[PDB]
């Protein structure tokens, strides 16, 4: 018996007692976010979330975690996207992300909406998640840029996208990573993340200290859209 903690490179973790087969299965398993405070407590089978409820990790005694459930009836489950399905509940936000970022008009002229921090945090802090449908590089690189505003490479085999009309918050808010604008002097980077609901995706992690209400930006790393080429020239100058 005993308790087992599995920490992912991104900071998140799975905690619980493994069954006779040594698998994280039961009604009291939990995924704990990188803040080591926010958690999804409930039913998991072999580490996969079946029915998790929002909870707060109060403390840990000799490896034993003590959770307190958050008021509400919102349950979460593994819900990895496909090429055509972005989410089973596109309007159910991620609790960890909801407490750290919000969408508003960007401070970047003519950029549209942007992603902003709700709190002051230090370097290397995971702030948002970049979930989306999963498609191939061939499909993406073979179509017009007008359709690739939200495409993000996950790896050599998969591209994550937030296609219309999901690029509108009123239609999709399960994750908000696609709302962060570009900057050649970014305060964040896209990083790998293993999410209990979204599965393998990317997240937005700060590179340094960020203040409350500061706009979060990332270097797109782009051949690229016109607005990008223009900004690039404007950057190479006055730099």
């Amino acid at each position: 018996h005993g308790v087992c903690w599995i920490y992912y490179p991104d900071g998140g973790s799975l905690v619980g007692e493994v069954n006779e087969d040594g698998e994280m299965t039961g009604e009291k398993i939990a995924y704990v976010y990188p803040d080591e405070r926010t958690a999804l407590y409930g039913k998991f089978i072999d580490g996969e979330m079946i029915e998790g409820k929002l909870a707060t990790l109060m403390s840990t005694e000799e490896g034993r975690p003590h959770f307190e459930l958050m008021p509400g009836n919102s349950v979460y489950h593994f819900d990895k996207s496909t090429s055509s399905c972005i989410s089973t509940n596109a309007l159910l936000p991620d609790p960890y992300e909801s407490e750290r970022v919000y969408v508003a008009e960007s401070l970047i002229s003519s950029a549209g909406e942007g992603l902003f921090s709700k709190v002051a945090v230090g370097p290397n802090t995971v702030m948002s998640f970049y979930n989306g449908v999963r498609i191939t590089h061939q499909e993406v690189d073979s179509r017009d840029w007008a359709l690739n505003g939200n495409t993000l490479s996950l790896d050599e085999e998969t591209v994550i996208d937030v296609p219309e009309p999901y690029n509108h918050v009123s239609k999709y808010c399960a994750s908000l990573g696609h709302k962060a604008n570009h900057s050649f002097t970014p305060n964040c980077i896209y990083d790998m993340f293993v999410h209990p609901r979204f599965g393998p995706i990317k997240c937005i992690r700060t590179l340094r200290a960020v203040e409350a209400d500061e706009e979060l930006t990332v270097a797109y790393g782009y051949e690229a859209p016109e607005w990008y080429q223009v900004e690039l020239k404007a950057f190479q100058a006055t730099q």
Partner: peptide
């Protein structure tokens, strides 16, 4: 090539 990296 037409995606963020």
């Amino acid at each position: 090539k037409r995606s963020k990296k």
